[PDB]
Design a protein around this ligand. Structure first.
Ligand code: BGL
Ligand code: BGL
Ligand code: CA
Ligand code: CA
Ligand code: CA
Ligand code: CA
Ligand code: CA
Ligand code: CA
Ligand code: CL
Ligand code: CL
Lengths: 673, 673
């Protein structure tokens, strides 16, 4: 009887454990390239001296050996370095075989078949399928990350922290990456089979999947629905009808599953941190060490001159006049891998940004950009460095613009305001890790100025004032500020002060004027004076958005002297939302939790919805409808979670209502077992 | 100045599109009879009311008006049914003329001249030439085929399917008719100027080219080199030195062009499907709807008694005795046209056979034969009905013959074995369409025997055994069969079993004995016995031909009882050969393809040649030399094809080496615009 296969034991638990892929909820054989895995093949008879087994693996719709998307190798001792199979032992008709794959193999879904040469004939049968990912544990793999602690954080951690807020009050929201949640790995993999690149040339695309630079750039494009039926639809208008307020999301899970479930229609809506969290999930799921980065005072230089313009009118009104803009903050990602295309000094963290800001080669894609290169100003290197360098270190010019006279006139230039407190979650904790020094030389140093010039070269008053915050700033309470002015001349001066307050979106989008006022003051030499700014809840509540941001401006003028513009963006805190576990947490053991929220307003809050999730704590997202809550009353909502993986877990919740959209809350929980 | 032509616009693109002749690669004006075409004739002046224009068309070496091979008609309305010219419009000196031809005009190359009567004189000038073909679109043309799908398959399709194999397992080979390839039409037209009929009387020949029955019969003679320096030299010997193995060809293109390239020397070598594929090409190019028919168990009755004899000796050897013979299968063609010579009930499909088996009027020609007439047994009607009727319905007599005693004796008579699974490619797909019901009444039905007698009238054991296949049959593997015997007697019987195994050509030609064995058995009443028949690769490899067929025979004798003859022809499969395109296919876009072949033998295969072709995919035939391939090794050959016509195309390959002649592969490819 001709040689043949009766069955195959993939020893999935054993291999996935050794390959560090055991956390994915999938039942599939998930492996990482460049590392051996062992299988048991039960034949119908003993391997004959004149018989031969040839293993065949292939990925993509057009597998070919020349493209490395297909390999044929014989069961023969020794490793060719690339694909190979070694007969480790024979017991009866069972063959213990060790299979090896090259460190540079394309990632993705593969099929394995067995060609059998026996008795003057040939037979072929499919053995099965498996998934192959990047290997951060393998020294020769481009995504190699040697340190244990870092690799765990940047690859194995599914709970994260993204910094937000403003440079004056940095905050943070929890984010459920959930790369191990059911179907997430599958969906992230399917993204590559849906890109513009794949539709253009599937054979070439699949072959390029052995490159983190290529995979990274594709994802920075596919995470946004722009140009390719990607995942997230961006919206910075303040009005999110037809979707969800970008701030209500708590993780990447619901986003990706909704994308797939909707037949791949855009998920509405997202803003930069949503794009980043989702991209991070994809990157970590595929094996590319990655983290999320927050840059405050992030500039969008559409001019390629490393300079951005902001405008105000004589009355102190901020204007949306230039195509460029400065965001309170912008979030993006960094992937870890060598850069064979740039050289040995440019490996390490690489910037990747799925937020659609600047078109690259016609489409909304961004990165990878060597962070090391950005710091040195080597903006001629791929990819998108001019733009990225601009985000972290463009100069900022303030202009005065009077539409009535059509006259425009330069006021000042700030070369240190843009690119501050660049942050990312610390390894092993929620602390804030400041990586500003990695993106650029110190502000005020001759070096950052030399680099700026270098980068650009490649691409080409009596009155002083200050806005100070007085007392708590929280949605529901009145806003109290103080404009402090001082006369630094030896002559008494008369200053005319025009002020305004506008609610804004975090990127700078102006929503509405909520307050304005003018005043004239008499200041003797050295005299210091102050003008109080009071904005009631009744005045700002109507036009305040989930960003809880307000732009305060004061244009001060003295006869014969240029205007003095005093700026300040303030952020009002949301009332507190709390989560509490009512007992010890143990895996597979139900634990009661309760949400607490007190309405600080004189009116009730309605249409209250509580959204809860957390990988390893709850399967998917829990949605709970909470009844109208009277003024000064408290809502107590109880629900049960069911831990599934022991360790330090993160439970996140969002509480949205008519007067308070997207109030966030997070609770760390230690699950034992 | 006298009236004269300045230039003429044949509006080729427009007229060919209307005449359904736009697919031919030629630059010439190709038209179909009975349909008008439009030309623009720019004269040197206006057409005077006293001037006159006479058009003159002519075809052949002796253009004659009474023979319809020459026609003179005035530029005046009133379509005289046949040739005519109508002045549709006059703009400046440009005359828009519409020319009509008769539905019964002779096909072929025509010259068109113009006679001008101006200013009391006469001038004459040649306008140009055009090609005129049959018109299956014209209701009054004898080749008319009203159904769209059928006409598209039988006239416009250049990719085909020919069924082969045996009654025990019907296979199929792809064939590239290529009627639209460069020079093919021209060559097919030239065949008519090279026939015995043309050389005999060119004047009458060309005049007769208005008759599809005539054109059809001529081609059935000229496709074979016999008697007239025709195209193909047949060879059924198993040895093809000095030419190509009949099974290596993939189409009619290479064949016709070679015929022309060699100064009309015979192309070596062909067998029935090759003659048929080539004839089919000629028929379709000239405009005669046609398809290829495969008849299994095809009989060659040379005695005209509708009976064929097969002989075996006592030792179980098949013998080559008697003029007749029974082919495992035989291929031929059917053309579609009315039969004015036979009557209203005999139109439709007409048998045409270019394979030289039986001379007709001393020439190797065959048909047309009304298929409807064959079914009815109307064998007195032209042409060659006795022979064709016998091919599909002759009775088979099995004889025993011992040359040592010179004695011969009947063993059995079979009236159902001849003419089975008569098949043709389905319209629009590669499915097998069985047309047995068109050639004869049901085997076993009273009618079938009524017609058989009618046709002939116009011309004038205790042991039962079965041969069964044990395991797969493939060139390289051993052959395993079993002779199953059973004694149906009430008394114990002793049976002597003599067996043999002969490699054969598909037509019955005996090549060589590769195995023989004898055994005597004693079987009790109802007892069943089995005798194993095992033939190793070494035993048959030396005598197996490209046909890959072996004839197994068993003559069982019991004292006082007649011999029981058990027969079984088997087909060994060739090792697999596959083609795979590595991307989408689009017009003018080069796309890579890969050939996959694995050597199953313990020895290497040499002289490896890969032949590839396919209309609309490659211009002509691609020839690739493949390096020697060691045992158990795989050959990885890559090459590019260049789609030139959108639609479903057919790629064909032939891989020949010393140990494996003519391995076939076929791949359907969808070419986008
Ligand atoms: C120079 C004095 C002003 C700076 C510190 C003021 C004390 C508290 O700091 C305030 C916070 O309380 C406030 O909610 C946020 C939001 O924008 O802004 C900070 O500057
Ligand atoms: C009675 C035996 C026929 C029943 C089918 C048994 C399964 C395989 O059938 C065999 C094929 O494998 C073989 O290659 C061809 C060639 O002639 O002949 C068939 O009978
Ligand atoms: Ca996109
Ligand atoms: Ca700019
Ligand atoms: Ca700076
Ligand atoms: Ca001939
Ligand atoms: Ca006969
Ligand atoms: Ca019959
Ligand atoms: Cl998954
Ligand atoms: Cl031609």
């Amino acid at each position: 009887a001709a040689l043949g296969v009766q069955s195959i034991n993939w020893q999935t638990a054993f291999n996935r454990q050794a390959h560090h892929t055991d956390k994915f909820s999938s039942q599939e054989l998930i492996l990482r390239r460049g590392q051996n895995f062992q299988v048991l093949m039960i034949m119908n008879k003993g391997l004959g001296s004149n018989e031969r087994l040839e293993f065949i693996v292939s990925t993509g719709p057009y597998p070919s050996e020349s493209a490395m998307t297909k390999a044929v190798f014989p069961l023969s001792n020794g490793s060719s370095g690339g694909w190979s199979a070694v007969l480790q032992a024979s017991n009866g008709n069972t063959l213990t075989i060790s299979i090896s794959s090259p460190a540079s193999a394309p990632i993705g879904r593969y099929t394995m078949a067995l060609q059998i040469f026996s008795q003057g004939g040939i037979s072929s049968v499919k053995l099965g399928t498996f998934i192959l990912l990047f290997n951060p544990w393998l020294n020769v793999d481009s995504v190699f990350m040697g340190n244990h602690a870092e690799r765990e954080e940047y690859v194995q951690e599914d709970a994260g922290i993204i910094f937000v807020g403003s440079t004056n009050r940095i905050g943070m929201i929890g984010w459920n990456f959930g790369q191990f949640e059911e179907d997430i790995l599958s969906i992230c993999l399917s993204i590559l089979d849906r890109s513009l690149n794949f539709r253009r040339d599937a054979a070439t695309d699949v072959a390029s999947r052995n490159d983190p630079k290529y995979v990274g750039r594709v994802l920075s494009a596919m995470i946004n629905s722009n140009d390719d039926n990607g995942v997230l639809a961006g919206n910075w208008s303040g009005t999110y009808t037809g979707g969800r307020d970008p701030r209500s999301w708590d993780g990447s899970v619901e986003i990706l599953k909704n994308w797939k479930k909707s037949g791949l229609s855009p998920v509405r809506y997202g803003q930069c941190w949503v794009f980043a969290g989702t991209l991070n999930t994809a990157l970590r799921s595929l094996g590319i060490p990655s983290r999320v980065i927050t840059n405050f005072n992030s500039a969008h230089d559409t001019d390629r001159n490393l300079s951005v313009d902001v405008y105000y009118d004589p009355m102190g009104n901020p204007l949306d006049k230039g195509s460029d803009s400065v965001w309170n903050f912008h979030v993006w990602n960094e992937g870890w891998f060598v850069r064979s295309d740039l050289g040995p000094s440019y490996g390490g963290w690489q910037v990747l940004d799925a937020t659609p800001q600047e078109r690259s080669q016609g489409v909304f894609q961004c990165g990878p950009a060597s962070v090391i290169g950005v710091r040195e100003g080597d903006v001629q290197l791929n990819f998108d460095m001019p733009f990225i360098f601009a985000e972290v270190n463009a100069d900022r010019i303030t202009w005065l613009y009077d539409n009535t006279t059509g006259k425009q006139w330069k006021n000042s230039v700030n070369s240190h305001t843009i690119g501050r407190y660049i942050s990312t979650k610390a390894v092993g904790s929620n602390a804030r890790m400041d990586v500003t020094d990695k993106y650029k030389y110190p502000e005020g140093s001759d070096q950052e100025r030399q680099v700026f010039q270098k980068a650009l070269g490649k691409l080409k008053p009596s009155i002083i004032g200050k806005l100070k915050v007085a007392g708590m700033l929280a949605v529901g309470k009145e806003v109290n500020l103080v404009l402090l002015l001082k006369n630094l001349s030896r002559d008494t001066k008369t200053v005319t002060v025009n002020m305004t307050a506008w609610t804004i979106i975090y990127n700078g989008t102006l929503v509405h004027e909520v307050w304005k006022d003018s005043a004239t003051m008499s200041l003797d030499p050295e005299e210091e004076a102050e003008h109080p700014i009071k904005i009631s809840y009744a005045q700002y509540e109507r036009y305040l958005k989930s960003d809880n941001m307000i732009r305060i401006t004061a244009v001060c003028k003295v006869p014969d002297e240029s205007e003095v513009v005093v700026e300040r963006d303030i952020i009002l805190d949301n009332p507190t939302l709390t989560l509490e576990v009512l007992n010890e947490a143990r895996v597979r053991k139900p634990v009661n939790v309760q949400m607490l929220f007190s309405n600080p307003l004189d009116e009730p809050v309605r249409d209250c919805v509580l959204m809860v999730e957390g990988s390893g704590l709850l399967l998917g997202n829990l949605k709970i409808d909470v009844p109208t809550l009277g003024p000064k009353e408290r809502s107590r909502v109880r629900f049960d979670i069911l831990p599934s993986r022991s360790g330090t877990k993160q439970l996140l919740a969002d509480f949205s209502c008519n007067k308070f959209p997207a109030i966030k809350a997070m609770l760390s929980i230690d699950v034992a077992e």
